[PDB]
């Protein structure tokens, strides 16, 4: 298709496109559209434009859903992304240099653009919502208005399920419909109970978050800013398996909240997939708990064999007092249809979100300067205590040498916490560190992740980075309130942790600890 | 040779560990083995992505060995089913790690052939089933022989053998092309200086011109430039160069070498987050002269003396800054203000206090009515600058300026932002 | 259904074990698994082989879950790594244990498929290399959950479920094909009874005769008993039938059911070790009558009074015993005498002692000069007997002979001593 | 190709055959020959026909070699071995029924004949002597007379290598010389330290035992031969040394030292457990430097031999003795028998027969195979003193056994009677009337015979048990004073004795059987294997 005109400036390099008839547009990376005329039909959906903008997200790992021309009647656009630097981060991490854009597109590309046309030659997948997937989901937004009660929808699959795609499909549609209905208080809640591929949640964390305009789709890798987080919990790993017993407990605490607000309306969650394994064990208590008015199975010929017992076994008829309902369906697909990564590892990706947060000034602005350059706000742990009340550890490491503790904390991601309901501090003291005692500490508040640059023992101060975005939420709290730090096994980024020439040149004299540059002695290889 | 993260801090942490695992002393004070596993049970807190296998199972084995040797009506002797289990478990994890990593060595190898290369005792491969695929777990003695041999074998094979067998141009490459463009752009500006000086209205009212005649104006009119376009094109390269916040300090260093107060005025008007990016870099370079007495800063080199610095740059900046704009970004200045402290920031807050006390003078325009939500934020701000002037004026005095001038010229409050930071790599406090 | 060895004495014992392993209702003080594993630890001792896999694993696991339960000072070294280590080992075993035996095969169902067949949730089989292969060991909670879950499964499928699915003929055939040839040979004997007497010479001296004339006789010496050979063959079928020391006690059970005074003479002479087997069986039969009123032995059916027994059978054997043969096997006898003590033996020994003297009065042969080396044996035998005789005469008077007729017929401890009177028990209760 | 001379021979089934014929003789079982005239060619060996009886052991499991004729010059032959019992085991043991005689023979079976004749039609395979082996085995012969020093010969093989037959071939070859050398008093002592398929030693045991020159007994007797006398022995208690490595090496180390103390000079022979792949190179590597072997040997060839190479060379030393000052290296084809090794006789099935042959073995050549439960056990009393028994020894695991259930474990468990050489002190920890050696150790103890417990009486404190009959009166011989130790180790009491076949023994129907259950096993209780 011969290209529609493009006009530079004033800012954002906004580009306007005319496509003959109704045609599939291709976009990679950020952009915001305000379509004056015609009907937009991405994934066979309707989005009228009347001076109303909608931000788009187009990551590479997923398939990018092209944009259809729908009536009526057609034939600023191609608005650049609001965020200053999120694209910029590629330099700090350079396995992510092509998340937003391909290496050699058929375009002289530009720094200025936050979007990129991908015309066929590039070979990126564009695959549209499979009609097989359509009737199972088409049947759901019909249940939304006539349910006469808030409807709980549960989607479950193993990784490679394409489960993320399904809930995204539901969210944008449930999202469009809520706007149309007047007056609707039914703001659907997205309940992310999977650490492993977190959506809308801190990495290796669990977040219950409200999904309120303005319009954003489809995949943002957690930088979307279309959600508000009412409450969240720190799982501390990229698997429920490291702590399944705790996690259901952490999740169990979260769902009850919905009745704590006693909410009513649409809600959605994606369970940790657990298609074959302990997951058969994992799923059968929250199907028991979430009162799911709609389960969803996608395994098909995946195979779909592993999940046989659970659907009937955990059904216990209808758990909810009012809903009293059951549902059993299967849709079989693997998506994207092309290889699931599209040359993008989830564990390689999982590191981006960690890095991407620690440089988020605000939702629309990102700075990719290594965190080392930036000053890190200082927390002084108290015996007494002021600030930090205790440091909390996973169960296994409850016996530890006092001396090594300073070494262990430094340069490792930790999650900040607040005491909330009053309790005895109940912490043993080691080497001037108020270690948490007996673990426990059942009632607590999770505010943000924290990374520690340094600890000064004599001072009792603790040099800790937080993503300046939430600053000043930490500052906007009573100083008195006790703080607990939980050092779960969340991975610190290498590219950030010890930086580079070009990245930084440091000083010649200084010696960097925790780093050795001798080639490894044979047999020193890590078991992975 | 790309660096490796290692949970110990230095080879003097891992030389010390070797002694603990194999003390050669049976008992009491000399032996330091309980502790030795209690630190590889620490690295595991950071670990175990970084930690090598060869130090894990030498702390896994030795942990189970301290289990069976308990001599006070405790541990292995009273009941010995677990102890047998532990001996075998840490051993399977031992062989498998060297034995089954596979990825380190090419796939599809028979284990013994895989076994042959590393120096593994051949029986160890025979070792792997031990208790998994045989009805009764092996003898509490036979477990003992392997463990003691294994520590010996690992120590001979890994701890003391010296074998070491088992680039990043692009980062240099990316910067150089970029430098060529900052230098390419800067020179273009020098040429455009007359045009910039002349066409002053263009880059001053960037904020004002929301509406442009050209967009409104009619096409193909019957009735019916180089200068404006060039500046606009050149003021884009700056913008594009300023989007990459990583090289923010690179540009500032480059600009200062070529420093001109018109470019200062220019950039302070058309790049977001520039007004505070300079003073920070200035508060940086001003700071490092005081502390380090041997290093000549670009800023010091540019300005020998205080008043020269004060009039030429500090004084120039204060006038330029847009007061309405300044408020929006103020928590920036706050942290920066808190973030870096020096007599330079003393004079700054006093100055930028005065500039907000001459705007209320001429401020007496007609429109009182529409600003009743704009005074309190100015009240809170001025209050914030007074506190910070008094907290700085108790530490900093006129003497320092002499301190800056006399340099030779070469021809804990809860959640807080630390005031002065020198990039330190997760060490040195 | 041929019996299987199992370490526990009784089913009741097993019932005892199950309750210990899962305390009913409460576990607070009755946990009774510290003891439970103590026992199974013994069954392992009797044999590793005998114990079932499920039983072995139910103790191995409950071992490890008990290991973590230590909460008291002085604080232990334990890093919670052995315990993390222990929990897994039972599982790799316990789970490996169900699939592999009975038996893992060249043609076998893939592991996931097998887990389904038994009733194993296929979330186990993920377990089997789950610990071994993975770099780092799983956290305590994951293991804790699995044991407290798996243990319930063991209780769920084996402890609380009865599903049963999972010699007589061929070994009775060889015995059949013995008894018939026996009863064929005895029914060959009676028809010969007359012949044996006429030919006293053939049976009596078979051991005795060194040389045979026919071999000695020259070829073509000069121009010139199928009742002898017919005897020897019948006798051969008696020796051949006697090589088998297993059915010895059934050759006799048939002999005493058809007692011939003449036969005994024949047997003792031509059947090695026949002299001490009979008397041994006469005692086991005799005592048995004493111990139980009820079972009137073949002996009491053959003999209804002590006197009848003494003249007909008991006396007769003594007369025909070779003095040398009895000597040359004394060790068998002392055991025979040692093993079983009863008045009958006393009468035997005394009668055996007596005849030993009357063969000394008769002693003045031409061959007397030779005798001196062998004199040092006869006396010793006389010497042992006095010890045995004097022994019994303190336990058994002639008051017992009355306790054999009165039964109505049915119409210290010394080291390594033989146990004198024995009734076979299957390794239980003596 | 026609049978000959099946003379009836009265009692004993004595038989005759002719030296002259050019076809090799075959036979299966326990027979004994004196040749009339003409030499014999057994395993390429020569024995003259001049009226000396030689027994021939032909168990089925081993390959059976023909009997060869040679000059000079011919043309009681073949007559039954004097064993009442040995042949009769099958009725007691189903598995070993065909051990001496093939199940279907195509010869007329005779019940009264010890020895059967086999001719091609029958399955059994005669390896005879490999040619490849001979050059090494032959050349060993040239070094017996010649050396002028005691020659210590070691042979190491993986089980199924064929070490046991290479030794007997050496053993047979050497014995022939000892009879004919004057004066050669250097009777070889076999030094059998393999409990895996032990030959010449008590089940799960270890023995250094002298070999008698005459009268001849060949070739494999399953340890039932009358040709060896036990000088000293030790009981590992396990199928393999690996279960108890610590003792065996120690257990062996004490064995060789005995050789020195009696100050033997002359031939000695040993087979180690082969241990080809495994811990074995280290374990062997300990007593190679101790045994001072003149001629270490190897048989694996395409064993494959790869595992058994490097450790020994490090293990190999310049000398084990001042006079010797030498070592020798050799490798050999390792395959005999050519046909599959089990031949319907897995070693694991044969071993439990050896345990059986002892307990039911009345005398040197007389065996009674009635189920033990008829025989009456002898009784000695474990005691508070105790005088008969002071402590029972348990391996290191099993330490925590609770008292009450101690009695149940003992009954029905094979145990090894030990005598304590004079001891500084008794080391008894006692639970519930059984004195148990709490710390193990107790190096002093001696091995007389194994025993199998019938039952134990807590109250009297008497311990009824069986002992193999042949061993009495040796137990009788030991002074009353001497302490007695019962050692419990993992040896397999045979099933067949434990519950007799119902036909074999008649029990009152009512009487409970303590250790067995006849219920079908609920799924799924199985012995992992």
PDB file of C-alpha atoms in Angstrom, chain D residues 286-383:
ATOM      1  CA  UNK D 286      44.522 -51.306  49.684  1.00  0.00           C
ATOM      2  CA  UNK D 287      45.297 -55.035  49.896  1.00  0.00           C
ATOM      3  CA  UNK D 288      47.269 -55.275  46.652  1.00  0.00           C
ATOM      4  CA  UNK D 289      50.084 -53.431  48.426  1.00  0.00           C
ATOM      5  CA  UNK D 290      49.404 -55.666  51.443  1.00  0.00           C
ATOM      6  CA  UNK D 291      49.180 -59.093  49.810  1.00  0.00           C
ATOM      7  CA  UNK D 292      52.511 -58.573  48.041  1.00  0.00           C
ATOM      8  CA  UNK D 293      51.217 -60.369  44.972  1.00  0.00           C
ATOM      9  CA  UNK D 294      53.774 -61.853  42.602  1.00  0.00           C
ATOM     10  CA  UNK D 295      51.310 -62.162  39.727  1.00  0.00           C
ATOM     11  CA  UNK D 296      48.304 -59.841  39.597  1.00  0.00           C
ATOM     12  CA  UNK D 297      45.877 -60.944  36.870  1.00  0.00           C
ATOM     13  CA  UNK D 298      43.118 -59.555  34.650  1.00  0.00           C
ATOM     14  CA  UNK D 299      40.497 -61.180  32.468  1.00  0.00           C
ATOM     15  CA  UNK D 300      38.166 -58.489  31.139  1.00  0.00           C
ATOM     16  CA  UNK D 301      39.558 -58.113  27.564  1.00  0.00           C
ATOM     17  CA  UNK D 302      36.519 -56.576  25.904  1.00  0.00           C
ATOM     18  CA  UNK D 303      35.134 -56.617  29.437  1.00  0.00           C
ATOM     19  CA  UNK D 304      34.880 -53.839  28.821  1.00  0.00           C
ATOM     20  CA  UNK D 305      37.962 -53.367  30.999  1.00  0.00           C
ATOM     21  CA  UNK D 306      37.985 -49.598  30.970  1.00  0.00           C
ATOM     22  CA  UNK D 307      37.089 -49.028  34.611  1.00  0.00           C
ATOM     23  CA  UNK D 308      39.605 -51.538  35.971  1.00  0.00           C
ATOM     24  CA  UNK D 309      42.840 -49.914  34.811  1.00  0.00           C
ATOM     25  CA  UNK D 310      44.166 -46.692  36.336  1.00  0.00           C
ATOM     26  CA  UNK D 311      43.561 -47.289  40.045  1.00  0.00           C
ATOM     27  CA  UNK D 312      45.661 -50.450  40.228  1.00  0.00           C
ATOM     28  CA  UNK D 313      48.668 -48.893  38.502  1.00  0.00           C
ATOM     29  CA  UNK D 314      48.658 -46.233  41.203  1.00  0.00           C
ATOM     30  CA  UNK D 315      47.848 -49.166  43.446  1.00  0.00           C
ATOM     31  CA  UNK D 316      50.718 -51.129  41.930  1.00  0.00           C
ATOM     32  CA  UNK D 317      53.961 -50.854  43.899  1.00  0.00           C
ATOM     33  CA  UNK D 318      57.606 -51.842  43.396  1.00  0.00           C
ATOM     34  CA  UNK D 319      57.606 -54.576  46.073  1.00  0.00           C
ATOM     35  CA  UNK D 320      55.611 -55.958  49.035  1.00  0.00           C
ATOM     36  CA  UNK D 321      58.569 -57.719  50.645  1.00  0.00           C
ATOM     37  CA  UNK D 322      62.361 -57.505  50.737  1.00  0.00           C
ATOM     38  CA  UNK D 323      63.139 -60.707  48.835  1.00  0.00           C
ATOM     39  CA  UNK D 324      60.409 -60.282  46.186  1.00  0.00           C
ATOM     40  CA  UNK D 325      61.380 -56.902  44.659  1.00  0.00           C
ATOM     41  CA  UNK D 326      58.967 -57.315  41.737  1.00  0.00           C
ATOM     42  CA  UNK D 327      55.507 -57.001  40.160  1.00  0.00           C
ATOM     43  CA  UNK D 328      53.814 -58.607  37.137  1.00  0.00           C
ATOM     44  CA  UNK D 329      51.179 -57.368  34.689  1.00  0.00           C
ATOM     45  CA  UNK D 330      48.764 -59.342  32.515  1.00  0.00           C
ATOM     46  CA  UNK D 331      45.390 -59.225  30.765  1.00  0.00           C
ATOM     47  CA  UNK D 332      43.266 -62.092  29.458  1.00  0.00           C
ATOM     48  CA  UNK D 333      40.112 -63.026  27.569  1.00  0.00           C
ATOM     49  CA  UNK D 334      37.478 -62.874  30.290  1.00  0.00           C
ATOM     50  CA  UNK D 335      34.661 -64.991  28.874  1.00  0.00           C
ATOM     51  CA  UNK D 336      33.673 -68.302  30.382  1.00  0.00           C
ATOM     52  CA  UNK D 337      31.255 -69.921  30.123  1.00  0.00           C
ATOM     53  CA  UNK D 338      30.515 -69.034  26.476  1.00  0.00           C
ATOM     54  CA  UNK D 339      26.821 -69.789  26.887  1.00  0.00           C
ATOM     55  CA  UNK D 340      24.800 -67.396  29.017  1.00  0.00           C
ATOM     56  CA  UNK D 341      26.209 -67.424  32.539  1.00  0.00           C
ATOM     57  CA  UNK D 342      23.112 -68.089  34.634  1.00  0.00           C
ATOM     58  CA  UNK D 343      22.315 -71.217  32.648  1.00  0.00           C
ATOM     59  CA  UNK D 344      19.056 -71.203  34.577  1.00  0.00           C
ATOM     60  CA  UNK D 345      21.186 -70.619  37.668  1.00  0.00           C
ATOM     61  CA  UNK D 346      21.454 -66.987  38.726  1.00  0.00           C
ATOM     62  CA  UNK D 347      24.046 -66.596  41.460  1.00  0.00           C
ATOM     63  CA  UNK D 348      21.372 -65.059  43.687  1.00  0.00           C
ATOM     64  CA  UNK D 349      19.429 -68.328  43.435  1.00  0.00           C
ATOM     65  CA  UNK D 350      22.469 -70.535  44.098  1.00  0.00           C
ATOM     66  CA  UNK D 351      23.675 -68.616  47.163  1.00  0.00           C
ATOM     67  CA  UNK D 352      20.577 -69.478  49.201  1.00  0.00           C
ATOM     68  CA  UNK D 353      21.320 -73.137  48.425  1.00  0.00           C
ATOM     69  CA  UNK D 354      24.714 -72.912  50.118  1.00  0.00           C
ATOM     70  CA  UNK D 355      23.072 -71.632  53.287  1.00  0.00           C
ATOM     71  CA  UNK D 356      20.755 -74.630  52.965  1.00  0.00           C
ATOM     72  CA  UNK D 357      23.441 -77.268  52.343  1.00  0.00           C
ATOM     73  CA  UNK D 358      25.189 -76.364  55.604  1.00  0.00           C
ATOM     74  CA  UNK D 359      22.238 -76.520  57.952  1.00  0.00           C
ATOM     75  CA  UNK D 360      21.044 -79.795  56.481  1.00  0.00           C
ATOM     76  CA  UNK D 361      24.556 -81.225  56.157  1.00  0.00           C
ATOM     77  CA  UNK D 362      25.021 -83.997  58.738  1.00  0.00           C
ATOM     78  CA  UNK D 363      28.609 -84.958  57.938  1.00  0.00           C
ATOM     79  CA  UNK D 364      31.448 -84.565  55.497  1.00  0.00           C
ATOM     80  CA  UNK D 365      29.613 -86.577  52.856  1.00  0.00           C
ATOM     81  CA  UNK D 366      26.201 -87.236  54.400  1.00  0.00           C
ATOM     82  CA  UNK D 367      23.339 -84.779  54.077  1.00  0.00           C
ATOM     83  CA  UNK D 368      19.844 -84.997  55.502  1.00  0.00           C
ATOM     84  CA  UNK D 369      17.403 -82.613  53.874  1.00  0.00           C
ATOM     85  CA  UNK D 370      14.416 -82.915  56.167  1.00  0.00           C
ATOM     86  CA  UNK D 371      12.984 -79.485  56.894  1.00  0.00           C
ATOM     87  CA  UNK D 372      14.874 -78.067  59.845  1.00  0.00           C
ATOM     88  CA  UNK D 373      11.664 -77.634  61.850  1.00  0.00           C
ATOM     89  CA  UNK D 374      11.673 -81.382  62.494  1.00  0.00           C
ATOM     90  CA  UNK D 375      15.261 -81.402  63.767  1.00  0.00           C
ATOM     91  CA  UNK D 376      15.470 -80.216  67.345  1.00  0.00           C
ATOM     92  CA  UNK D 377      17.709 -77.187  67.940  1.00  0.00           C
ATOM     93  CA  UNK D 378      20.326 -77.022  70.633  1.00  0.00           C
ATOM     94  CA  UNK D 379      19.796 -74.390  73.309  1.00  0.00           C
ATOM     95  CA  UNK D 380      22.070 -71.871  74.999  1.00  0.00           C
ATOM     96  CA  UNK D 381      20.909 -69.059  77.223  1.00  0.00           C
ATOM     97  CA  UNK D 382      21.335 -65.355  76.688  1.00  0.00           C
ATOM     98  CA  UNK D 383      21.487 -63.997  80.178  1.00  0.00           C
TER      99      UNK D 383
END
